Amino acid sequence: VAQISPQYPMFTVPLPIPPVKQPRLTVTNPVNGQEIWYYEVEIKPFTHQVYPDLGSADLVGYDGMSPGPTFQVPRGVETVVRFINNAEAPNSVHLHGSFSRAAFDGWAEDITEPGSFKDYYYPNRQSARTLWYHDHAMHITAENAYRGQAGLYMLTDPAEDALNLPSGYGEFDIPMILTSKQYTANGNLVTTNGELNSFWGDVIHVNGQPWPFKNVEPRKYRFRFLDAAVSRSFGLYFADTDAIDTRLPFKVIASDSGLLEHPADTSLLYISMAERYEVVFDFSDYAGKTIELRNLGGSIGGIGTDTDYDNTDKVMRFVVADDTTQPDTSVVPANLRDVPFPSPTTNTPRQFRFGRTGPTWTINGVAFADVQNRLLANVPVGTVERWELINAGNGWTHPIHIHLVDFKVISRTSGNNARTVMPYESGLKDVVWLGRRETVVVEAHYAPFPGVYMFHCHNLIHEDHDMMAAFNATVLPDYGYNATVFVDPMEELWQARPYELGEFQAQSGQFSVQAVTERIQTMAEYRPYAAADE
Ligand SMILES: *[C@@H]1O[C@H](CO)[C@@H](O[C@@H]2O[C@H](CO)[C@@H](O[C@@H]3O[C@H](CO)[C@@H](O)[C@H](O[C@H]4O[C@H](CO)[C@@H](O)[C@H](O)[C@@H]4O)[C@@H]3O)[C@H](O)[C@H]2NC(C)=O)[C@H](O)[C@H]1NC(C)=O
Ligand SMILES: NC(=O)c1ccc[n+]([C@@H]2O[C@H](COP(=O)([O-])OP(=O)(O)OC[C@H]3O[C@@H](n4cnc5c(N)ncnc54)[C@H](O)[C@@H]3O)[C@@H](O)[C@H]2O)c1
Ligand SMILES: *[C@@H]1O[C@H](CO)[C@@H](O[C@@H]2O[C@H](CO)[C@@H](O)[C@H](O)[C@H]2NC(C)=O)[C@H](O)[C@H]1NC(C)=O
Ligand SMILES: [Cu+2]
Ligand SMILES: [Cu+2]
Ligand SMILES: [Cu+2]
Ligand SMILES: [Cu+2]
């Protein structure tokens, strides 16, 4: 249907690459003698000239940018990020893809108000993967993400660097953060506030930029795709502009949780909200051509319900040089890793139905705000469970995210007989798309940390109103590892704290090297991640 946003100068602005976030300093962990990397992120309003000929757009971003700066953390290095709220609404930061303790996981009620900050202590122990950090504050997640509270967090591993995949952040390893937004006639954003169904958006962005281009060399590039949209799911394919409908083959090498066992040869990538897929596209056969990254219409080929507009088929353009500057010395190995799948289980799966109760998106008839009923599962830490995730609906689709766990997609059924499990779903994931009338069974190890965690639809409109519930990964009174201060996400030790803007800007008081050092050393003494010591 007709684009509502003003006409954009398509494929005229280069793909921006979020800058790498650098730690401010490192603190000696007194427990193990190891350096914890300490970062400061200031959440703050800013404007961006999205449309060259109109007004600017009001955004609120990590370090006053959108997307947020890209973290780059080696496995084994613990991180503390101080997220400082200097904006006009509360925040709760979730590191999506991280087995963070309950009080470091962005629990929706665990907010930071303006004039407060929270210290988030991250383990960085899991398999190399593309994580992303984004807002999760109760009822306002859609608008905080949409206005720019989302960024990339790359967990790296020398074992994976040895695979010799296309490499170099912003070189041949390119972040591809997809969003879908709507603008006013004056080039500001149309708010998601009030929207209770879905906010599709009609303007497709990569890394915060409508319909960009990038100059590429005729060689292999690694693309880290993230659907950071409020409501839009994609069916991604690449086509030569001389044959705009002919899908060019590529390889999927990674899902949410990291590398697949083997690359998946693919010409169409289904990607819904919060899913990450890492692609190697080989431009060597298309020297001198323009390749368009495109998006499947008819509501993602009948899998979705998303509205399609005049330009939502277009994502961006790659302009392929005649030659390389230097040889492509990268490969895509047939054997990427042994995926650490859970031990299969025969116990009857739990059932979760993603539907609506009046005007509210619900799980098993419950809204997250109904505290009394929203705890839908107690799972003893160490258990492997199958959950059957049911979308009986034809009029909505639900990408389901389970916090804490990596899971295996066991099965999909479709009441429109559309598809079963996809080859790029072969590995470990933390989000799975329930298309129209789809039921998916996932299997997960509920390990290794006890605590109360969320699971929900990652359609942020659905999430906010109010398609989200909790599970408790439980332990016995004798388990140890300081579980009594780490199971409740609202534990007062880990709560946000007020600050004065003067002390932040002068890096004095609570922001002095001495206060930061004392705070982190105190947090580290409780040993949040010791139970995953192997
Ligand atoms: C999510 O699951 C966690 C477990 O992983 C769970 O935390 C556990 O809560 C229970 C009950 O509150 C705790 O056991 C308590 O220990 C304290 C302190 O010594 C006592 O106050 C309690 O004693 C009363 O109740 C006993 C048991 O019925 C009676 O025998 C006694 O007479 C007392 O009246 C009680 O034993 C346990 O310590 C925690 N475990 C941890 C590791 O924190 C949590 O409650 C669950 N969360 C939610 C939101 O459901
Ligand atoms: N167990 C039960 O309660 C029960 C009994 C009989 C039938 N059903 C099932 O109900 C389903 C209804 O048939 P359908 O596939 O035509 O509809 P559906 O499942 O897509 O929609 C169910 C209801 O929600 C409404 N709806 C759809 N999309 C919506 C959206 N985005 N926002 C708000 N409301 C929306 C529909 O108009 C309808 O009134 C069938 O699959 C049928 O098998 C359930
Ligand atoms: C649980 O957390 C407490 C509090 O940080 C730890 O107790 C501290 O332990 C360190 C090193 O053993 C001491 O120097 C501190 O003086 C302790 N503080 C208190 C209040 O006791 C304890 O080690 C942690 N337990 C586990 C199993 O991690
Ligand atoms: Cu998320
Ligand atoms: Cu998450
Ligand atoms: Cu949903
Ligand atoms: Cu979440």
XYZ file of C-alpha atoms and ligand atoms in Angstrom:
660
model
C 0.000 0.000 0.000
C 0.910 3.742 -0.383
C 3.930 4.952 1.654
C 2.779 7.385 4.423
C 6.287 8.721 5.305
C 7.608 11.479 2.968
C 9.592 10.396 -0.140
C 13.202 9.507 0.800
C 16.249 9.916 -1.571
C 16.765 6.103 -1.875
C 20.278 4.522 -1.774
C 22.036 7.980 -1.642
C 23.469 7.889 1.948
C 26.304 5.484 2.925
C 25.592 2.715 5.497
C 26.737 4.088 8.879
C 28.717 1.723 11.179
C 28.102 2.291 14.934
C 31.434 3.175 16.637
C 32.974 0.625 19.081
C 32.176 1.461 22.749
C 35.492 1.653 24.761
C 35.660 0.927 28.521
C 36.522 3.940 30.720
C 38.926 1.855 32.880
C 39.424 -1.659 34.354
C 38.973 -2.716 38.028
C 40.966 -5.576 39.649
C 38.482 -8.264 40.644
C 39.683 -9.064 44.219
C 38.243 -12.664 43.950
C 40.431 -13.848 40.993
C 42.924 -10.950 40.301
C 41.352 -10.392 36.839
C 40.503 -7.040 35.211
C 36.741 -6.264 34.968
C 36.097 -3.774 32.077
C 33.989 -0.818 33.357
C 31.908 1.224 30.877
C 29.683 4.356 31.204
C 26.690 4.797 28.821
C 24.635 8.013 29.112
C 20.989 7.629 27.887
C 20.081 11.096 26.499
C 17.807 12.826 23.961
C 19.290 14.016 20.637
C 18.043 15.008 17.158
C 19.031 13.488 13.820
C 18.528 14.990 10.323
C 16.965 11.768 8.847
C 15.403 13.559 5.804
C 17.870 16.009 4.154
C 15.115 18.546 3.172
C 12.784 18.446 6.257
C 13.001 18.963 10.034
C 14.947 16.629 12.381
C 13.756 13.551 14.395
C 13.707 13.430 18.231
C 15.506 10.271 19.525
C 16.779 9.031 22.910
C 19.929 6.886 22.592
C 22.786 5.186 24.423
C 25.577 7.846 24.344
C 23.188 10.148 22.349
C 23.299 7.962 19.220
C 21.165 5.332 17.456
C 22.018 2.630 17.117
C 23.972 2.527 20.391
C 27.764 2.048 20.217
C 28.892 -1.511 19.453
C 30.482 -3.396 22.371
C 33.294 -5.821 21.501
C 34.079 -8.161 24.419
C 36.299 -11.296 24.419
C 34.855 -14.408 26.126
C 36.355 -14.641 29.650
C 36.413 -10.793 30.343
C 33.695 -9.721 32.852
C 32.049 -6.323 32.156
C 30.252 -3.739 34.340
C 28.232 -1.189 32.349
C 26.900 1.886 34.209
C 23.746 2.864 32.283
C 23.099 6.480 33.326
C 19.578 7.785 32.695
C 19.752 11.458 31.580
C 16.466 11.253 29.586
C 12.746 11.906 30.310
C 11.452 8.309 30.866
C 12.671 5.287 32.829
C 14.841 2.519 31.351
C 15.726 -1.116 32.024
C 18.653 -2.505 29.936
C 18.473 -6.139 28.710
C 21.607 -7.711 27.185
C 19.761 -10.085 24.805
C 21.748 -13.355 24.284
C 23.408 -13.188 27.810
C 22.745 -15.586 30.798
C 23.015 -12.504 33.115
C 21.781 -12.842 36.729
C 18.056 -11.893 37.205
C 18.995 -8.375 38.577
C 21.384 -7.716 35.583
C 18.979 -9.023 32.875
C 16.666 -5.974 32.279
C 13.601 -7.319 34.195
C 10.761 -4.954 33.014
C 10.073 -3.592 36.601
C 13.820 -3.122 37.401
C 13.806 0.486 36.078
C 16.291 3.315 36.332
C 14.529 6.724 36.596
C 16.024 9.915 35.085
C 18.778 11.189 37.479
C 19.689 7.577 38.446
C 22.165 4.997 37.001
C 22.459 1.189 37.374
C 25.609 -0.996 37.290
C 25.034 -4.126 35.160
C 27.557 -6.958 35.734
C 27.813 -9.217 32.606
C 29.546 -12.650 32.525
C 30.687 -12.898 28.821
C 31.103 -16.730 29.302
C 28.764 -18.012 26.532
C 29.693 -19.059 22.942
C 30.810 -16.220 20.638
C 27.540 -14.633 19.368
C 25.983 -11.332 18.270
C 24.160 -9.998 21.360
C 22.265 -6.707 21.453
C 21.484 -4.403 24.398
C 18.100 -2.629 24.354
C 15.420 -1.123 26.589
C 12.971 -3.434 28.394
C 11.134 -1.044 30.838
C 7.561 -2.189 31.629
C 4.917 -0.913 29.070
C 7.355 1.551 27.378
C 9.814 -0.954 25.686
C 8.360 -0.312 22.167
C 8.826 3.497 22.326
C 12.263 3.353 24.091
C 13.603 0.863 21.404
C 11.899 2.794 18.522
C 13.378 6.166 19.732
C 16.852 4.498 19.632
C 17.626 2.453 22.843
C 19.223 -0.549 21.023
C 22.822 -1.395 20.162
C 25.066 -4.332 19.291
C 27.278 -6.330 21.727
C 29.759 -8.711 19.972
C 31.068 -11.559 22.236
C 34.252 -12.824 20.429
C 36.413 -15.962 20.847
C 39.929 -16.752 19.468
C 38.659 -20.329 18.628
C 36.142 -18.669 16.167
C 38.770 -16.166 14.824
C 40.762 -19.335 13.720
C 37.839 -20.243 11.290
C 39.204 -17.320 9.224
C 35.673 -16.001 8.367
C 35.491 -12.500 6.713
C 36.727 -10.148 9.520
C 37.285 -6.569 10.717
C 34.451 -4.586 12.305
C 33.271 -2.150 9.593
C 35.684 -3.820 7.089
C 34.318 -7.244 5.947
C 32.375 -7.877 9.277
C 29.379 -5.498 8.920
C 26.551 -4.958 11.447
C 23.111 -4.964 9.705
C 20.626 -3.637 12.339
C 17.181 -3.536 10.628
C 14.386 -1.274 11.823
C 11.050 -0.144 10.320
C 9.703 3.311 11.269
C 7.230 5.970 10.149
C 7.938 9.737 9.844
C 5.712 12.883 9.785
C 5.531 15.297 6.800
C 8.197 17.384 8.705
C 10.695 14.447 8.988
C 10.158 13.649 12.722
C 9.166 10.113 13.896
C 5.505 8.999 14.231
C 5.353 7.754 17.911
C 4.383 4.093 18.695
C 2.423 5.404 21.796
C -1.267 4.386 21.698
C -0.646 1.612 19.077
C -2.032 -1.669 20.568
C -1.963 -3.953 17.449
C 1.451 -3.581 15.617
C 3.602 -0.702 14.393
C 4.818 -1.865 10.949
C 6.596 1.334 9.811
C 6.974 2.098 6.071
C 10.646 3.291 6.055
C 13.315 0.517 6.182
C 16.597 1.459 7.971
C 19.966 -0.283 8.343
C 22.032 0.984 11.358
C 19.594 3.920 11.819
C 19.688 5.081 8.118
C 16.758 4.805 5.611
C 17.589 2.878 2.408
C 21.412 3.256 2.444
C 24.070 2.009 -0.008
C 27.566 0.696 0.615
C 30.534 0.322 -1.774
C 31.733 -3.310 -1.496
C 34.595 -5.240 -3.092
C 33.898 -8.349 -5.173
C 34.711 -10.677 -2.186
C 33.203 -12.318 0.954
C 31.587 -10.190 3.691
C 30.105 -11.320 7.014
C 26.757 -9.510 7.686
C 25.348 -9.572 11.278
C 21.575 -9.204 10.663
C 19.484 -8.074 13.696
C 15.731 -7.322 13.405
C 15.568 -4.440 15.917
C 12.090 -3.462 14.497
C 9.089 -2.788 16.784
C 6.748 -5.060 14.716
C 8.239 -5.814 11.247
C 9.463 -9.304 10.284
C 11.485 -9.744 7.076
C 12.122 -12.313 4.388
C 15.605 -11.196 3.270
C 17.082 -12.002 -0.184
C 19.786 -10.464 -2.399
C 19.146 -9.678 -6.093
C 21.237 -8.132 -8.910
C 19.426 -4.937 -10.036
C 19.626 -6.385 -13.674
C 17.457 -9.319 -12.405
C 15.692 -7.842 -9.314
C 13.560 -11.049 -8.680
C 16.388 -13.704 -8.998
C 17.546 -14.634 -5.444
C 21.339 -14.956 -5.081
C 22.512 -17.791 -2.801
C 24.384 -17.061 0.459
C 25.372 -18.926 3.651
C 23.941 -18.566 7.145
C 26.821 -19.276 9.600
C 25.203 -18.190 12.896
C 21.875 -17.914 14.786
C 21.009 -16.034 18.040
C 23.306 -18.166 20.294
C 26.262 -18.414 17.834
C 27.676 -20.531 15.012
C 25.632 -23.265 13.271
C 27.191 -26.789 13.128
C 27.583 -26.114 9.349
C 26.768 -23.164 7.080
C 23.170 -23.211 5.773
C 22.986 -22.515 1.962
C 20.054 -20.081 1.750
C 18.559 -17.666 -0.835
C 15.772 -16.370 1.496
C 16.286 -15.496 5.215
C 13.147 -15.303 7.467
C 14.085 -12.912 10.339
C 11.615 -11.675 12.989
C 11.982 -9.303 15.949
C 15.104 -9.869 18.110
C 16.505 -12.736 15.961
C 20.191 -12.466 14.890
C 21.491 -14.347 11.843
C 25.056 -13.956 10.577
C 25.392 -14.313 6.774
C 28.406 -14.672 4.438
C 27.581 -13.136 1.049
C 30.251 -13.649 -1.676
C 30.213 -10.583 -4.036
C 33.079 -12.078 -6.202
C 30.593 -13.251 -8.963
C 29.031 -9.710 -9.238
C 32.018 -7.398 -9.911
C 30.683 -4.113 -11.431
C 27.032 -5.010 -10.479
C 24.638 -3.425 -7.910
C 23.109 -6.045 -5.497
C 19.869 -4.984 -3.742
C 19.070 -6.441 -0.350
C 15.285 -6.934 -0.655
C 12.354 -8.025 1.548
C 9.614 -10.582 0.620
C 6.097 -9.096 0.304
C 2.640 -10.514 0.885
C 3.328 -10.380 4.648
C 6.686 -12.285 4.416
C 5.322 -14.695 1.761
C 2.161 -15.452 3.805
C 4.106 -16.398 7.038
C 3.261 -13.019 8.662
C 0.475 -10.396 8.806
C 2.760 -7.311 8.345
C 1.498 -4.432 6.103
C 3.665 -3.961 2.966
C 4.240 -0.374 1.658
C 5.671 0.999 -1.652
C 9.335 0.718 -0.454
C 9.313 -2.001 2.280
C 10.577 -4.464 -0.434
C 13.841 -2.461 -0.419
C 16.465 -2.619 2.388
C 19.765 -1.316 0.874
C 22.121 -1.461 -2.160
C 25.674 -2.895 -2.381
C 27.727 -1.344 -5.228
C 30.364 -4.047 -6.140
C 33.764 -2.724 -7.454
C 35.415 -4.333 -10.559
C 38.390 -5.432 -8.336
C 39.605 -6.178 -4.793
C 42.265 -3.816 -3.251
C 43.818 -7.091 -1.881
C 43.154 -10.866 -2.025
C 40.159 -12.281 -0.154
C 42.027 -14.715 2.169
C 38.836 -15.600 4.192
C 36.996 -18.952 3.978
C 33.628 -20.354 5.181
C 34.475 -23.758 6.699
C 31.997 -26.677 6.233
C 32.536 -27.528 9.959
C 32.034 -24.391 12.148
C 31.610 -25.869 15.679
C 30.097 -28.632 17.826
C 26.822 -26.849 18.826
C 26.290 -27.573 22.577
C 22.682 -28.884 22.170
C 20.720 -29.873 25.340
C 20.331 -33.621 26.196
C 16.951 -34.506 24.566
C 14.037 -35.028 27.049
C 10.853 -37.203 26.930
C 8.879 -35.253 29.649
C 5.579 -33.811 28.306
C 6.130 -30.223 27.028
C 4.688 -27.177 28.878
C 2.107 -25.343 26.691
C 2.083 -21.544 26.218
C -0.684 -19.982 24.090
C 0.069 -16.538 22.546
C -3.335 -14.931 22.030
C -5.546 -12.074 23.216
C -7.879 -11.632 26.220
C -10.023 -8.605 25.291
C -7.744 -5.829 23.912
C -4.617 -7.349 25.624
C -1.991 -9.687 24.124
C -1.636 -12.554 26.663
C 0.204 -15.827 27.361
C -2.221 -18.563 28.647
C -4.803 -15.738 29.287
C -2.368 -13.738 31.572
C -1.006 -10.156 31.154
C 2.527 -9.595 32.659
C 1.111 -6.726 34.819
C -1.005 -9.423 36.676
C 1.778 -10.222 39.178
C -0.418 -12.856 40.958
C -0.740 -15.038 37.763
C 2.304 -14.092 35.562
C 4.690 -16.743 37.090
C 3.841 -19.560 34.631
C 6.694 -22.080 35.383
C 9.036 -23.217 38.179
C 11.987 -25.096 36.600
C 14.718 -26.611 38.839
C 18.136 -25.289 37.574
C 19.780 -28.072 35.513
C 16.456 -29.378 34.061
C 15.962 -29.747 30.262
C 12.341 -28.893 29.339
C 10.408 -28.735 26.073
C 7.954 -25.794 25.760
C 5.252 -25.929 23.075
C 4.741 -22.302 21.900
C 1.288 -22.052 20.293
C -0.042 -19.285 17.982
C -3.645 -20.444 17.199
C -4.176 -17.062 15.484
C -4.213 -16.210 11.793
C -4.383 -12.432 12.470
C -1.067 -12.078 14.435
C 2.466 -13.575 14.594
C 4.678 -13.829 17.695
C 8.488 -14.181 17.837
C 8.905 -15.710 21.322
C 11.996 -14.857 23.391
C 13.001 -16.916 26.483
C 15.542 -15.118 28.756
C 18.488 -17.050 30.423
C 18.470 -20.034 27.978
C 19.754 -21.011 24.560
C 17.240 -23.452 22.969
C 16.911 -25.902 20.066
C 13.887 -25.548 17.699
C 12.503 -29.174 17.744
C 9.389 -28.733 15.527
C 7.127 -26.260 13.745
C 3.590 -26.959 12.522
C 1.557 -24.456 10.394
C -2.256 -24.387 10.182
C -1.690 -22.806 6.679
C 0.714 -25.718 5.843
C 3.333 -22.949 5.103
C 6.595 -24.490 6.458
C 8.235 -26.513 9.277
C 11.734 -25.946 10.771
C 14.174 -23.817 8.660
C 17.785 -24.986 7.987
C 19.190 -21.775 9.743
C 17.120 -22.931 12.847
C 19.462 -26.025 12.991
C 21.585 -24.504 15.792
C 20.835 -22.681 19.072
C 18.427 -19.728 19.283
C 16.765 -17.576 21.989
C 13.924 -16.267 19.749
C 11.640 -18.251 17.438
C 8.993 -16.882 15.091
C 5.437 -18.319 15.483
C 4.114 -17.366 12.042
C 0.335 -17.444 11.268
C -1.213 -20.546 12.992
C 2.247 -21.895 13.917
C 3.136 -24.071 16.898
C 6.888 -24.511 17.705
C 8.390 -26.894 20.309
C 11.726 -25.714 21.760
C 14.082 -27.637 24.073
C 16.330 -25.758 26.539
C 18.705 -26.427 29.457
C 17.410 -24.117 32.293
C 20.973 -23.497 33.478
C 23.144 -22.469 35.030
C 21.832 -19.680 37.349
C 18.719 -19.659 39.601
C 16.425 -16.625 39.328
C 13.163 -15.101 38.033
C 13.339 -14.397 34.250
C 10.939 -13.160 31.533
C 9.695 -14.840 28.365
C 7.524 -12.968 25.887
C 6.665 -12.067 22.372
C 9.314 -9.671 20.920
C 6.680 -7.828 18.930
C 7.316 -4.761 21.218
C 3.622 -3.543 20.811
C 2.462 -7.036 21.973
C 5.205 -7.190 24.656
C 4.124 -3.834 26.212
C 0.356 -4.706 26.198
C 1.006 -7.240 27.683
C 2.359 -10.460 26.111
C 5.033 -11.412 28.674
C 5.272 -13.833 31.647
C 7.962 -15.184 34.001
C 9.586 -18.409 34.966
C 11.668 -19.192 38.076
C 14.783 -21.326 37.634
C 14.775 -22.740 41.211
C 17.438 -24.181 43.592
C 17.224 -25.847 47.063
C 18.047 -23.825 50.228
C 21.595 -25.460 50.367
C 22.662 -24.682 46.709
C 25.076 -21.847 47.734
C 26.715 -19.368 45.276
C 24.964 -16.482 47.131
C 21.644 -17.508 45.466
C 19.678 -15.620 48.199
C 20.874 -12.216 46.753
C 20.730 -13.206 42.998
C 17.239 -14.926 42.504
C 15.046 -11.745 42.966
C 15.607 -9.248 40.042
C 14.470 -6.358 42.359
C 17.196 -7.169 45.057
C 18.078 -3.788 46.660
C 21.881 -4.427 46.476
C 21.631 -4.258 42.602
C 18.973 -1.479 42.269
C 19.611 1.818 40.424
C 21.057 4.752 42.474
C 20.534 8.531 42.152
C 23.454 10.709 40.835
C 24.083 14.501 40.408
C 24.779 15.506 36.748
C 27.818 17.549 37.952
C 29.569 14.477 39.448
C 29.061 12.485 36.132
C 30.489 15.346 33.958
C 33.464 15.994 36.391
C 33.829 12.164 36.979
C 33.867 12.950 40.735
C 31.946 11.534 43.752
C 30.292 8.210 42.739
C 32.102 8.607 39.334
C 35.638 8.949 40.848
C 38.062 6.102 39.916
C 38.073 5.329 43.701
C 34.220 5.085 44.088
C 33.867 3.056 40.797
C 36.703 0.727 42.003
C 35.063 0.246 45.496
C 31.544 -0.365 43.984
C 32.788 -2.970 41.370
C 35.100 -4.730 43.943
C 32.083 -4.978 46.327
C 29.807 -6.344 43.514
C 32.563 -8.847 42.434
C 32.933 -10.238 46.062
C 29.369 -11.708 45.823
C 30.657 -13.829 42.846
C 27.574 -13.563 40.532
C 28.795 -16.021 37.803
C 30.947 -18.548 39.864
C 28.434 -21.430 39.302
C 29.468 -21.416 35.584
C 33.185 -21.928 36.526
C 33.933 -25.238 34.631
C 12.020 -18.419 42.935
O 12.687 -19.545 43.423
C 13.633 -19.306 44.469
C 14.413 -20.584 44.716
O 15.393 -20.766 43.680
C 12.808 -18.885 45.668
O 13.659 -18.435 46.710
C 13.528 -19.277 47.860
O 12.435 -18.846 48.691
C 12.215 -19.723 49.808
C 10.915 -19.328 50.487
O 10.920 -17.898 50.676
C 13.416 -19.608 50.760
O 13.254 -20.430 51.935
C 13.095 -19.541 53.074
O 14.281 -19.276 53.851
C 14.125 -18.113 54.696
C 15.428 -17.656 55.416
O 16.043 -18.593 56.325
C 12.957 -18.333 55.677
O 12.422 -17.038 56.009
C 11.784 -19.202 55.184
O 11.331 -19.952 56.325
C 9.893 -20.012 56.420
O 9.336 -20.963 55.502
C 9.876 -22.293 55.640
C 9.528 -23.189 54.434
O 8.114 -23.308 54.221
C 9.416 -22.848 56.988
O 10.040 -24.113 57.244
C 9.773 -21.907 58.144
O 9.040 -22.353 59.291
C 9.568 -20.391 57.878
O 8.268 -19.916 58.284
C 12.046 -20.131 53.985
O 12.508 -21.445 54.323
C 14.735 -19.935 50.038
O 15.879 -19.560 50.852
C 14.801 -19.182 48.707
N 15.988 -19.647 48.042
C 16.909 -18.772 47.614
C 18.114 -19.450 47.002
O 16.763 -17.538 47.722
C 11.979 -17.704 45.296
O 11.129 -17.459 46.399
C 11.163 -17.878 44.022
N 10.678 -16.604 43.511
C 9.399 -16.320 43.283
C 9.110 -14.919 42.826
O 8.521 -17.152 43.411
N -10.512 -23.137 21.935
C -11.231 -22.121 21.482
O -11.494 -21.132 22.163
C -11.716 -22.190 20.054
C -12.936 -22.752 19.661
C -13.281 -22.769 18.324
C -12.419 -22.230 17.390
N -11.224 -21.669 17.760
C -10.256 -21.113 16.760
O -10.402 -19.711 16.616
C -9.759 -19.326 15.381
C -10.481 -18.111 14.842
O -10.544 -18.146 13.384
P -9.626 -17.194 12.462
O -8.377 -17.944 12.116
O -10.460 -16.608 11.378
O -9.234 -15.956 13.407
P -7.928 -15.593 14.284
O -7.549 -16.783 15.102
O -6.985 -14.895 13.362
O -8.613 -14.502 15.254
C -9.411 -14.757 16.448
C -10.211 -13.506 16.759
O -9.303 -12.392 16.967
C -9.532 -11.383 16.015
N -8.229 -10.856 15.566
C -7.440 -11.325 14.522
N -6.358 -10.603 14.357
C -6.433 -9.603 15.323
C -5.568 -8.538 15.668
N -4.409 -8.271 15.054
N -5.964 -7.741 16.692
C -7.105 -8.027 17.335
N -7.984 -9.001 17.108
C -7.588 -9.756 16.071
C -10.355 -12.017 14.892
O -11.162 -11.090 14.194
C -11.191 -13.027 15.670
O -12.358 -12.380 16.166
C -9.739 -20.588 14.492
O -8.424 -21.036 14.177
C -10.466 -21.636 15.343
O -9.939 -22.947 15.198
C -10.874 -21.657 19.087
C 28.861 -14.324 48.828
O 28.977 -12.897 48.903
C 29.632 -12.404 50.060
C 29.631 -10.867 50.090
O 30.425 -10.275 49.034
C 31.042 -12.999 50.078
O 31.504 -12.684 51.390
C 32.673 -11.911 51.197
O 33.751 -12.767 50.863
C 34.973 -12.060 50.624
C 36.032 -13.081 50.186
O 35.674 -14.345 50.769
C 35.360 -11.334 51.909
O 36.620 -10.641 51.832
C 34.276 -10.328 52.263
O 34.740 -9.719 53.468
C 32.960 -11.089 52.464
N 31.851 -10.262 52.947
C 30.925 -10.743 53.830
C 29.773 -9.878 54.230
O 30.938 -11.865 54.321
C 31.101 -14.525 49.879
O 32.452 -15.005 49.630
C 30.182 -14.947 48.729
N 29.943 -16.375 48.723
C 30.043 -17.050 47.611
C 29.820 -18.506 47.736
O 30.345 -16.464 46.589
Cu 15.514 -8.531 23.193
Cu 16.342 -11.337 26.059
Cu 3.191 -11.065 19.558
Cu 12.882 -9.734 27.125
